[PDB]
Amino acid sequence: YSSPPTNLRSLRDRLTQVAERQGVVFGRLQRHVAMIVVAQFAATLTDDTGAPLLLVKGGSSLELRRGIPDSRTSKDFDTVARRDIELIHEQLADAGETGWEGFTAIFTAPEEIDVPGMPVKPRRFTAKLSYRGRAFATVPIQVSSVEAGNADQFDTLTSDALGLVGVPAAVAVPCMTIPWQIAQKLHAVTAVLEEPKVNDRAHDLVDLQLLEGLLLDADLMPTRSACIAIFEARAQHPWPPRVATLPHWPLIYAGALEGLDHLELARTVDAAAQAVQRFVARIDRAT
Ligand SMILES: [Mg+2]
Numbered sequence: 001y002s003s004p005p006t007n008l009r010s011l012r013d014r015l016t017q018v019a020e021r022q023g024v025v026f027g028r029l030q031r032h033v034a035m036i037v038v039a040q041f042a043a044t045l046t047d048d049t050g051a052p053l054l055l056v057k058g059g060s061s062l063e064l065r066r067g068i069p070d071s072r073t074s075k076d077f078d079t080v081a082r083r084d085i086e087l088i089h090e091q092l093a094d095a096g097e098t099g100w101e102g103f104t105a106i107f108t109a110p111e112e113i114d115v116p117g118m119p120v121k122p123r124r125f126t127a128k129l130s131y132r133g134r135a136f137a138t139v140p141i142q143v144s145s146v147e148a149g150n151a152d153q154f155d156t157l158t159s160d161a162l163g164l165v166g167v168p169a170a171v172a173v174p175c176m177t178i179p180w181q182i183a184q185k186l187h188a189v190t191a192v193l194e195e196p197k198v199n200d201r202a203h204d205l206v207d208l209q210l211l212e213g214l215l216l217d218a219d220l221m222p223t224r225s226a227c228i229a230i231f232e233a234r235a236q237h238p239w240p241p242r243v244a245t246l247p248h249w250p251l252i253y254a255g256a257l258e259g260l261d262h263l264e265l266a267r268t269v270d271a272a273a274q275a276v277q278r279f280v281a282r283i284d285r286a287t
């Protein structure tokens, strides 16, 4: 494509053409662009030394690490911020009005969410995107505070999705490194929740398998330290944990596998909880 889309209808038609070309669902690709678009806003938030203020996290980070086909499909945009929330929101809302390649975003008010082990309760808000004056997509956003050394470093991942529909701007998203993604997700999947609510995070089992695959050999001492840091800082269940399965997880885990038949994952919730438990033990042996 020679030029960027002239309007929203063009972008929608340019995307559905690229979606069928790459063998993915249009809605999945459309949310990817929007997710990519907010990342660009978040990337422009910086401190006095040029280092980023936000680090994307969770499902959006694994999508950028393995692409659309090899990553679980989720809608949340998770971020860890090195500054306080209303300063983050003002900066995000400031970057939205300015724009990026014709994309403008207005954000909703941040709302504190119930969190058991964080002295600074993360916040949740949404960005209503538009492309040249026409509403394009709404992305749920989540921002949480720093934890030990989880924002000390960052990976810079990229995606070519917008380069396909004629928006050639270079995408570079700062991401939380995998050792801390393993620690946070390990602590979440083995979390015992107070009576009212139950831990439904069977999907984290799938991701921990993906993150283990991305780590390859490398060295698990960084991952072990991150787990030692996260489990202690939250001061709930200790380390190492036991990957317990709950009665309603078999179907939730099967839903988390949708679209990952080509991948070498455990196809059942038990074998997955066993693989993640082997991975936990493998982390705990480090020297
Ligand atoms: Mg949890």
Ligand SMILES: [Mg+2]
Pocket (backbone or CB within 6 Å): 209, 210, 212, 213
């Ligand atoms: Mg593995």
Ligand SMILES: [Mg+2]
Pocket (backbone or CB within 6 Å): 244, 245, 246, 270
């Ligand atoms: Mg079980």
